[PDB]
Design a protein around this ligand. Structure first.
Ligand SMILES: [Ca+2]
Ligand SMILES: [Ca+2]
Ligand SMILES: [Ca+2]
Ligand SMILES: [Ca+2]
Lengths: 144, 19
């Protein structure tokens, strides 16, 4: 794995963690998943975690984090993966991402992207140039 | 799901860095 990527993931890990313990909990991520315009219950909150959880404890630990990350870092057989990021980017649930919802998520995570950066990035998967990224456009970008 | 969508977001945001 590229050191550059490692340093980048370091940033992500720094945003999910809010206790300084070094482990991803349900209470920490739940807070972010809340700022996304949603409100999940204990059943939903663990459902999301179970997706990453493979040990059976209900917590995003390091062992699962490595495998989980490898499952996306080199994801080119996107099955449920498409939906994951699609449901995180598509807040309206219409199936079309834009500088509308993307801006919100980019700011929610705390990445170094301005409003102009959002529109620019949006044209990476935007082939027709409609200002939105559809499922087809996303598939041919993530899987291909 | 969550932390993984971040990895997906990073991949999608890393894919822009090409052309
Ligand atoms: Ca923590
Ligand atoms: Ca676990
Ligand atoms: Ca949408
Ligand atoms: Ca489009």
């Amino acid at each position: 794995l590229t050191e550059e990527q490692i340093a980048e993931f370091k940033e992500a890990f720094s945003l999910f963690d809010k206790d300084g313990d070094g482990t991803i909990t349900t209470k920490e991520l739940g807070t972010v998943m809340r700022s996304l315009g949603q409100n999940p219950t204990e059943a939903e909150l663990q459902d999301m975690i179970n997706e990453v959880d493979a040990d059976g404890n209900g917590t995003i630990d390091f062992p699962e984090f490595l495998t989980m990350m490898a499952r996306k870092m080199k994801d080119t057989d996107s099955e449920e993966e498409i939906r994951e990021a699609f449901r995180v980017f598509d807040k309206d649930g219409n199936g079309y991402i834009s500088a509308a919802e993307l801006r919100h998520v980019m700011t929610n995570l705390g990445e170094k992207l301005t409003d102009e950066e959002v529109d620019e990035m949006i044209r990476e998967a935007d082939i027709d140039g409609d200002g939105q990224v559809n499922y087809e456009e996303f598939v041919q970008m993530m899987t291909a | 799901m969550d932390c993984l969508c971040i990895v997906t977001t990073k991949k999608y945001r890393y894919q822009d860095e090409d052309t």
